[PDB]
Write a protein that binds this ligand. Structure first.
Ligand SMILES: *Cc1c(COP(=O)(O)O)cnc(C)c1O
Ligand SMILES: *Cc1c(COP(=O)(O)O)cnc(C)c1O
Lengths: 405, 405
């Protein structure tokens, strides 16, 4: 069983005061706080083992290269990929999607084809496909939403045909907390020869993820939302697909050969897609974050988080004129608006109480437009958040409603 | 005046032992060790101030955004850029050059134009231009080398004409240590309406750099070679140029607006070119590295490093059958080969003595081909290296020559 008090003791930021009051950090969906196990692992690498990593001859460089490839292996086991060589180190989810859209997209999506996304996607899983479709002369199709924040699955027969090359779909909405039925949608996409990219940036911290079970063709997520450092993410690609993908960004570490007269050759994938000096510090930190999460146990995390979410939704019933967006079974995040008050004002009062929520469009303007609002508030309920923090949120919304009503 | 013993005490890795012997780290040109001022600044941000940075409403996010923009300002002052908004945070020098080659290159280099590089360039400042020229139907021209490792400047009349759109040129060679005469080459390029990108990745740690004095149009360098964290670099672009450059990689943080029916608009530059969550941890560390270097004083650093280099070149005269490559007045690095022994074997013996040098082509295969060798050894002599470490290198080469000769 899970002990939130023991977990919280690992996170030094949670002792912080904001506005003279104890911090209630309810914005882990934008970025997660990091335990000292992760902070110190990166710091210790810099203090005692630092070097460049291009299988350099000398000992520090050789050992740093081994550490980095060990993290790649650890990450592949974390998502149950079949091979470590199916994972690419990327700057984050946004860059991973741009990499797929350029390298794979440019050579596999042609004039008259279509790509399917959903109306709940983060901008990072929309704009690369808009740009690709424009470059290539293809059509971007959109799975629409139901009022409860789930996809209108009944529209899939109208969107999938023999010209559908790709479904790009979020695992878990960063706004609504909706978990989409990936395994079944992937089966349908594969019946038409379409590949599937899964945006897993809001999934990998909430429960186990198994890309062989899912059978997805691409899977992306960001380290900094997985209690890890900034500047590092993971792109999983099926080996058979990845080994055919052409280069993207160019230079050292990714070339095999450079000639001014004979041109340039490229090295094998996954390294083909990691140009320049990698973010070795962030990779060390990410490995430590995976070890930390695996030690707690993702099923223990999920159980505690589901209990906290059930408690929050129960308690929020006592807030007058509160509008919630999304399904009853949401993961991770609660999107809401208070009466007719603008989200910006609600979040400002909450911050004044020491409570950190996010306001605005959450990088999902088409989702805001579907609900006919310009913005929402969003509270994340992560594994280090508590019932008492939920009580502070509920009381704060009650006070705000009484003060501004 | 500079005190190497005080400086070295700031760098915890320099106490390391390699192979049971005290480390002599002579590979700072591949990547620099970091002082605890830099390591701890990043760690403290994670421990006490961490949050997402997209001018979030709540206090931690607002303060993190301010910290990041303060580093941008500090970096602009470090290179004497006129405005902080002329600097883009990039993954490193390689990504910065790829950004210029795609965004600026694709809309300013047309069929029948030419681009000029030199024969001493790092692959990162070659391959993006090869790819651009192929995309666009332009010609890549090359300034050749002299035997002493300087550019054949007399060839410039044959390479520059009214169709030259860009000169892409290294400030300091990562192999030879040659410092190129940028100010004069930039004047000539500008007479033809050509822009100039300067690869400054081996310059910014050795002496002051002033991009207004240089009048370069683009300037790039990497944090991890400037005693800073991995995963972060700086791209400087003249404001008038940068404000016309179209987007590159797409998603949140760089869009102004996303609509599924009306398309997408982009935000203003510099932020236009920073898609996704930035590497906030690395940006904090980079700011601390700039403060640390500025506190030591770049002119004090240059004076000490020049003295160390003069001592090394003097002492290396006592190594039999040593071949040095490059000019007498080199900065930072000494490239060499020992007799007919392969560089890999020489570097392996040096590593066995605890001495870290780099071997191989150094991401400069055309430079290796010019000298008709497959590889070289390279020792870097940075601000924390000592006369005693130079003595260990000289003795080691003597022992290797005696043992394998
Ligand atoms: C280090 C180096 C690069 C590449 O920089 P990264 O940090 O690996 O992207 C480019 N040019 C020169 C001269 C270099 O020394
Ligand atoms: C965080 C987020 C992204 C963007 O990830 P970055 O780390 O900012 O690149 C993409 N998709 C979803 C669902 C997200 O929550």
């Amino acid at each position: 069983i899970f002990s939130v008090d023991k977990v919280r003791a690992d996170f030094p930021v949670l002792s912080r005061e904001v506005n003279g009051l104890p911090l209630a950090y309810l914005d882990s969906a934008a970025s997660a706080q990091k335990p000292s196990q992760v902070i110190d692992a990166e710091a210790e690498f810099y203090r005692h083992g630092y070097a460049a990593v291009h299988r350099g001859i000398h000992t520090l460089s050789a050992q740093a290269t081994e550490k980095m490839e060990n993290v790649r292996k650890r990450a592949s086991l974390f998502i149950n990929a079949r091979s470590a060589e199916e994972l690419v180190f990327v700057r984050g989810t946004t860059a991973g999607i741009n990499l797929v859209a350029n390298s794979w997209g440019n050579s596999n999506v042609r004039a008259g084809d279509n790509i399917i996304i959903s109306q709940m996607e983060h901008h990072a899983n929309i704009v690369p496909w808009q740009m690709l479709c424009a470059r290539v002369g293809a059509e971007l199709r959109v799975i629409p939403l139901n009022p409860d924040g789930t996809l209108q699955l009944e529209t899939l027969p109208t969107l999938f045909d023999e010209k559908t090359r790709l479904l790009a779909i979020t695992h878990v909405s960063n706004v609504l907390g909706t978990e989409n039925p990936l395994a079944e949608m992937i089966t349908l996409a594969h019946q038409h020869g379409a590949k599937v990219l899964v945006d897993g940036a809001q999934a990998v911290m909430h429960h186990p993820v198994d890309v062989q079970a899912l059978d997805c063709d691409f899977y992306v997520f960001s380290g900094h939302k997985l209690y890890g450092p900034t500047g590092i993410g993971i792109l999983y690609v099926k080996e058979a697909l990845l080994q055919e993908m052409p280069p993207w960004e160019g230079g050292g570490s990714m070339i095999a050969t450079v000639s001014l007269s004979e041109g340039t050759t490229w090295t094998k994938a996954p390294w083909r897609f990691e140009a320049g000096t990698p973010n070795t510090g962030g990779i060390i930190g990410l490995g430590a974050a995976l070890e930390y999460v695996s030690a707690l146990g993702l099923n223990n995390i999920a159980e505690y988080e589901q209990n906290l979410m059930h408690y929050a939704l129960s308690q929020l019933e006592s807030v007058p004129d509160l509008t919630l967006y999304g399904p009853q079974n949401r993961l991770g995040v609660i999107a809401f608006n208070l009466g007719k008050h603008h989200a910006y004002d609600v979040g400002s009062f909450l911050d004044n109480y020491g409570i950190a929520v996010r306001t605005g469009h959450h990088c999902a303007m088409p989702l805001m437009a579907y609900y006919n609002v310009p913005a929402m508030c969003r509270a994340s309920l992560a594994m280090y958040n508590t019932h008492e923090e939920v009580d502070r949120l509920v009381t704060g919304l009650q006070r705000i409603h009484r003060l501004l009503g």
